[PDB]
């Protein structure tokens, strides 16, 4: 059986799998009070993606369509295409066009264009919101509001590359984005399908471990937390190595490649997400140079070392 | 000796070294006419990242610090931190910051930016002239031309995210950006210095390979191409797996997983770059799941198949 491995990367080095930026830093805190369901960055260790999980770190939280304009807003209805331009097939057993959001609220960005018979293009500010009525990417249409009354055109290819997150200054501070909130993705049209599992240690004295990133704010007071499961290389990595899991649970080790030392131990299920033993919120105190090594599968009665 | 790999990845799969996009298409054609010099996406075989080049492609034409408006105007200057806000170092044997853009052109996308205090945060459309007098990211400085005139604030974190590229002026139709023209890193009066080499075919009837991408435009007409020489997974992958590389060339098989068929080959160098048998200008029509497949090391004697 081929050897299992994670990349041999720092965590500044690796991106966050459920928005196009950088890990910053390693969190642990209890999750008990939501429901920890994320579908993007939802990959199995012998590299089954699951959700709504694609391979490439730029095109999360991408659009790809032609766009049509509501009369009388700033607002435009957004059909989507494949990520490659494709048509979108509403029938794939999955929850949503690949990398679509996986949280409630507005995602901020620019929408782009380029008319196709002279390659005359445009762009605008626009923002999505993910927990609209008209979100329904799973069906092939999302609504974008805009900076623009009538620039875009009808039959040309539009994408929106996302920035950040908004937030009303008016509300309670920090209240949107719900990071833990899925949309649904057929909007009040049906429930959502081919969801990855929602996640929950059970395992005495456990919490999960979290990849945790600041999505860039673009107006308000947004909750710029954004915590993923898997590093957008780990799911790169287990999709290209697709090592055969002996057990449901592997063995990770924290290490300091100059000094050889162990940080700490954690554990990384097949079905992909990494729990330690600690209780309460903790940013975890790494070295710079410090990164994962597998070593080895363990059975359903493991204790890890205490963080 | 580690064996050497590519990864198995279509091109569709990956990702521009030189902007953060998805790769679409390969293009051969002479280059006998330009400076074939990027500075991203450049990587030895055996794991050795050149000129500007890191790992993730969401940092590739991002850049973070804080802003200072010019007053009269509507520009403002970023002061680079480096991209976890530790102070930009500009006494590293590198071109300029990792990841700064390696083609002259006007990209345009967002600045960010929230105030540590209280969380508030805004964002603003913003173009980088990366020909222009201050673009001088080497000695850690660039102008950002905005919609504002007041709204950023001075001594908070400031991020850009790029989004595409613009065109205007009475100058012929996608005569911006120009792709093979590097910036001058330290200014119009400036000099370049540490640069990844210049690359060339040096064999009878070999071009380059270019791993290709359509830029999103944001105004105007243009010049969307963008060339790399190595898809960012490329570089992921040998940075990785450092294995030694046995000669100066690998051979490359292109392969069709539907018959196991070879389609082309190639040479990849192993200063990192590839080659093919082939004259003049041709867009490759390859099968969508098609992929690269390392077959052995060759001398420097060794005639390629016709492409």
Chains 1, 2 share one sequence.
């Not at 491995?5 to 950088?22: D, H, K, Q, Y």
């Not at 996986?102 to 005359?120: A, C, E, N, P, Y």
Request: proline content about 8%; hydrophobic content about 30%.
């Amino acid at each position: 059986s081929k050897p299992f491995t994670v990349p041999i990367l720092t965590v500044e080095e690796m991106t966050n799998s459920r928005f196009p930026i950088p890990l910053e830093k390693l969190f642990t805190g209890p999750s008990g009070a939501f429901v920890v369901q994320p579908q993007n960055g939802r990959c199995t260790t012998d590299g089954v993606l699951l959700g709504t999980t694609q391979l490439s770190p730029v095109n999360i939280c991408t659009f790809r369509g032609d766009v049509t304009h509501i009369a009388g807003t700033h607002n435009y209805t957004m059909n989507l295409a494949s990520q490659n331009w494709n048509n979108y097939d509403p029938t794939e057993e999955i929850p949503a066009p690949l990398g679509t959001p996986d949280f409630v609220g507005r995602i901020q960005g620019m929408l782009t264009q380029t008319t196709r018979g002279d390659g005359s293009t445009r762009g605008h500010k626009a923002t999505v919101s993910t927990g609209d009525v008209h979100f329904t990417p799973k069906l092939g249409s999302i609504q974008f509001n805009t900076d623009t009354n009538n620039d875009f055109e009808t039959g040309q290819n539009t994408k929106f590359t996302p920035v950040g997150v908004v937030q009303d200054g008016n509300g309670a501070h920090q209240n949107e984005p719900q990071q833990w909130v899925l949309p649904s993705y057929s909007g009040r049209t049906g429930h959502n399908v081919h969801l990855a599992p929602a996640v929950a240690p059970t395992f005495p004295g456990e919490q999960l471990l979290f990849f945790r990133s600041t999505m860039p704010g673009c107006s308000g007071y947004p909750n710029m937390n954004l915590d993923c499961l898997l590093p957008q290389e780990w799911v790169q990595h287990f999709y290209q190595e697709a090592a055969p899991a002996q057990s449901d649970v592997a063995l990770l080790r924290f290490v300091n490649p100059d000094t050889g030392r162990v940080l700490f131990e954690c554990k990384l299920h097949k079905s992909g997400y990494v729990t330690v033993a600690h209780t309460g919120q903790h940013d975890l105190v790494i070295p710079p140079n410090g990164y994962f090594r597998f070593d080895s599968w363990v059975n359903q009665f493991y204790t890890l070392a205490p963080m």
